[PDB]
Design a protein around this ligand. Structure first.
Ligand code: NAD
Ligand code: NAD
Ligand code: NAD
Ligand code: NAD
Ligand code: NJ8
Ligand code: NJ8
Ligand code: NJ8
Ligand code: NJ8
Lengths: 298, 298, 301, 301
């Protein structure tokens, strides 16, 4: 089926056991692949502590009894390309204390000398500084902050990992429905960016397909209560409810279901698949009407 | 702006003053065009009676005081291409009494000798014999009946009017959102067909653009209480409510708003516009979530 | 273990040979260990069964590990029909249709329930449009409706009758071509329409089947493949020019072997895809993504 | 009378010459009788104002009836900025930026309210990506974000500041290129991304503006046009090859004169379109519809 044994993979955007990031890394390992991580500096120490402590061990369990193992947990700030781009505030920011080589370019180099060429690239990271504000209120600063962090980070990740990705390697990034249709509350220009992330998924499928022979795809995924989601009865608690009531599949959306899907797009089975936006959302993309609306009877 | 004076137009699917059919014909006339009609035989006598009586005269008023005038009200059954295709039941059906030349091919000929070559083609007609049944219940007979009447009718209309349409002429057909996203209640395979109607709108934009130089477009339009709609607190009464509560524009959807749009796609202003699906629906296509759902607070 | 289909049973409708995507799926459903059954269009069941019995297709029946794919049952199946009573005497007595019965959908679906019991997986790999070499402006109504009766509705009726016997969490997947959403000249006779209806009935059914049965429904929009059915379209094959176009214009510059879609389907029909429904998956080497042919005669070589 | 815009006032942001779609719209908004105002990128207001005052563009300013289009006001306007405080001393004192002030969005939007009062119509016809000759894999972050700051966000800020002064039923429309939804090679520097953000912010804003103000928002995805801005992309113009491609591959085999989109916009911004919002309209001679370039080197001539 899917033995990715002898393949190296890099997962960017993993700092806990709740994000989609984790899930992906978890299914990749379960298929035999070597799995590394890029983690946001400030929250790195804690993540490692979590791991070392042996408290994320229930989460690291392989359906056979093995515990996942990571080839490296790399400090990574996708807001930064090369060292010359990191401000002096940040360099001096306490929470970035005693870590270096965390810019995209830098990590890419570290991975090559540490692990060699790789096969798989996962992009699981976004940041909207004005996510809670409607577009009519989102300022330029936030909009661009929301785009730089959540969209260009991908193009830059490809730009630097691509040159060290084997042929037939694959790369995946996670988008949200708000990119295509209006989803109130997904403000701060996160929708705008997500849309750019999808376009770039296509545009890159072309540039990476031709230059490197590397497939590039996106998953538009459904509501999941990651820590990044929890931080906006919350906006995503209501999100989960809607999708549960209105989608074709009346079932819960687990971190994994995206991991599963991700595995695929990252496995040989998907050798013909590129520039695709794959809906892992219990089929809610397909509905053109709320069935539980207050406008129909109950 | 839009003086279609000296242009001949044919509108298929008009039997009352409530359908989108009417609206289109009404805006076309108001721009100076000659306007003919194709009307379902059984309901022809009555339509004419309505007109002659001087009771649809409030509906026929031009924003200047003139009353619309039609160059011809032609019997038309779009379920039938050429006379050899009409069963012996129908030929003998009382409601088709004392009318002939109502097959598509036949009407096309009648229009040419009666009016000459034409410029504009409007397609405003659909029929689902199992519209009220979910797809899992729709039988082959109904599905195909639903497709023949509502989709192929267009391709056949182009096939026969195309050869008598001037260069730069245009043709328009009306679709529903259910074609792209799942709209419960729009069963009987009407959704399937609508989707075929859109594809064919594209496919024909290509064949009619190249062979005849004729533009071909569709309007995916919002809920309107035509008589054809009323016949399914009804399924469309609830339809109108939903769209009113959930769309970007909180406003009523009048027959006209589609007529307006139609005028455009049929005017010179749209000389570069072909194969398009244009949403005249108060912007509800753009939402990816019910705002009045019972899942959010009120 | 990431994809394990042991204990699950699959029905792959539309398999007559070993060149079509259909084959590739049965082969991919089965290395995953699923028990696989087939529906073969009646007029060529003899020619197909014989290629099997004889060994001509042994080369195509080899899995990775080096064992041979076997089938739980080869079912006569005409997708144009639903019920014995739908069959016209024209055929009831067609020399090629002789030697077989119970080959309508409702009938197959019965025999499968008798023979194998509830299924978990269902594959719709078939289509038929008599006027496909004809442009839409030259396509007959009869021929158009036939295309749709064969390539689109068949999927519906196939869900209706195989639905009740499908396990919760079951999957079904149909096959489509890009012509549905954008004009591809030469792919005529209403097939482009028919596939569009299909993709939409895949969104609709995903909803209905997804609620009543808890079954998922999906479409794999595939690129061009030299199969018996393709080579029949229209010297230099119309299918060949397509394959050529793709090879020169798709992001991934590579051959499209059927196995590709084979593996693509396997995903969609597996536990891995248990949150994926109503989608159209482009297994086309990324060609869906392009806005321009790159080898245009308008552009520099 | 089917399209009458007498009494309505329009602001067309992004007009420096008489070749761009921008021009064509002001010209189409105005034959409809609307009073029209312009925003010109500061560095070329002199060259533009002078072409007007002189008469060089009289040939382009003639309407059907044979009268001349006049403007209610020509406003200095840099879309990269929102507020006086957003302006860096770099520019505050750029030789080309001298002789003008109050050229940020919030400022223009003020002066327009002072000078003309509430508007009904708003046109976003501008874009700027310094690295557009660069593929995405060679595009800088700074240059990418600039593209987006200039071509996409500008639209947002333009709605924010012109919103409150817009009448209920007002309209706004931006401009896009097919590159947003499918790869068009050569259209780089992040512009493809930027336009995608734009089309999406056109769906989003249509909702927000559509509720708060009752204003409609729409996008016209246009085909290639030889404008100053295009000819600047990259011998044989990159824009020329595009125009050529289209002429050979689009359903309607004809020239795309700017007036086309000119009239297309006029519709969207008029009472006729009062139920149309959040849409992307392809004014491209139907090229959006095609799945294959028909003059491929893979296909027979
Ligand atoms: N939670 C959901 O249901 C949901 C829904 C739709 C889409 N998504 C998408 O999935 C992806 C991951 O979502 P998640 O919230 O499950 O994962 P998550 O909660 O772990 O958050 C994403 C990770 O990216 C990290 N990150 C933020 N800024 C970074 C920077 N500049 N450099 C490096 N890392 C940075 C965050 O710390 C976080 O660990 C995101 O891109 C998001 O857009 C999530
Ligand atoms: N009413 C709405 O809100 C609504 C919504 C979405 C789409 N539409 C579409 O708009 C079009 C017109 O809709 P409407 O209901 O407003 O108009 P309508 O109520 O007048 O019905 C369409 C016309 O077509 C005629 N017709 C049916 N079968 C025919 C046949 N085989 N040959 C010739 N004529 C035939 C009907 O008699 C009717 O007059 C339809 O195609 C429909 O799909 C309507
Ligand atoms: N071949 C391609 O490049 C291509 C591309 C996109 C989609 N598809 C789709 O894939 C499916 C099959 O793939 P293929 O190209 O290998 O076809 P194919 O080579 O298998 O030829 C048709 C297949 O379906 C069966 N079939 C044909 N008509 C039938 C009928 N009316 N009743 C029952 N069975 C019938 C035949 O047994 C045959 O195996 C079709 O639905 C087609 O639309 C094919
Ligand atoms: N030209 C085409 O074929 C084409 C195709 C699709 C979409 N468009 C869109 O149409 C719009 C303009 O059409 P065009 O091609 O005639 O452009 P153009 O020829 O008018 O050149 C850019 C125009 O916008 C203004 N402008 C440029 N940068 C600006 C800045 N940063 N601040 C304020 N104003 C600025 C200039 O005055 C100029 O008139 C753009 O948004 C572009 O994306 C153009
Ligand atoms: C219904 C919402 C589903 C949803 C949940 C989480 C998402 O991811 C993020 C969202 C915002 C920020 C920030 N800042 C960071 C991340 Cl990782 C998302 O894109 C969409
Ligand atoms: C919410 C529904 C909006 C809606 C209303 C009316 C429509 O038109 C028809 C529908 C069914 C039949 C039949 N038989 C005939 C027509 Cl003219 C439509 O397609 C969609
Ligand atoms: C141009 C290649 C795309 C393409 C190639 C082959 C396809 O399969 C069929 C095509 C036509 C008919 C018929 N009749 C039957 C089948 Cl199984 C297809 O659907 C689309
Ligand atoms: C290939 C033709 C498509 C095309 C042509 C011209 C366009 O307009 C611009 C293009 C680039 C820049 C910049 N920087 C500015 C503008 Cl106004 C466009 O958006 C898209």
């Amino acid at each position: 089926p899917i033995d990715l044994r002898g393949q190296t993979a890099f997962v960017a955007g993993v700092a806990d056991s709740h994000g989609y990031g984790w899930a992906i890394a978890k299914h990749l390992a379960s298929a035999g692949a070597r799995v590394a991580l890029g983690t946001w500096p400030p929250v790195l120490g804690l993540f490692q502590k979590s791991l070392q402590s042996g408290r994320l061990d229930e989460d690291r369990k392989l359906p056979d009894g093995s515990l996942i193992e990571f080839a490296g947990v790399y400090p990574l700030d996708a807001a930064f390309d090369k060292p010359e781009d990191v401000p002096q505030d940040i360099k001096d920011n306490k929470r970035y204390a005693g870590v270096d080589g965390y810019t995209i370019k830098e990590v890419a180099v570290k991975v090559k000398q540490d692990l060699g060429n790789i096969d798989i690239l996962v992009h699981s990271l976004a940041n909207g500084p004005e996510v809670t504000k409607p577009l009519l209120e989102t300022s330029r600063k936030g909009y661009l902050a929301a785009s730089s962090n959540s969209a260009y980070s991908f193009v830059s990740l490809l730009q630097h990992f691509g040159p060290i990705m084997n042929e037939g390697g694959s790369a995946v990034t996670l988008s949200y429905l708000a990119a295509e249709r209006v989803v109130p509350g997904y403000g701060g220009g996160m929708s705008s960016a997500k849309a750019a992330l999808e376009s770039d998924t296509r545009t890159l499928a072309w540039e990476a397909g031709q230059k490197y022979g590397v497939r590039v795809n996106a998953i538009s995924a459904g509501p999941l209560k990651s820590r990044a989601a929890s931080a906006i009865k919350s906006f995503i608690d209501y999100a989960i409810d809607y999708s549960y009531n209105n989608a074709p599949l009346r079932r819960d959306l687990h971190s994994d279901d995206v991991g599963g899907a991700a595995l695929f797009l990252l496995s040989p089975l998907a050798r013909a698949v590129s520039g695709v936006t794959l809906y892992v959302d219990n089929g809610l993309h397909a509905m053109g009407q709320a069935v539980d609306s207050r406008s129909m009877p109950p």
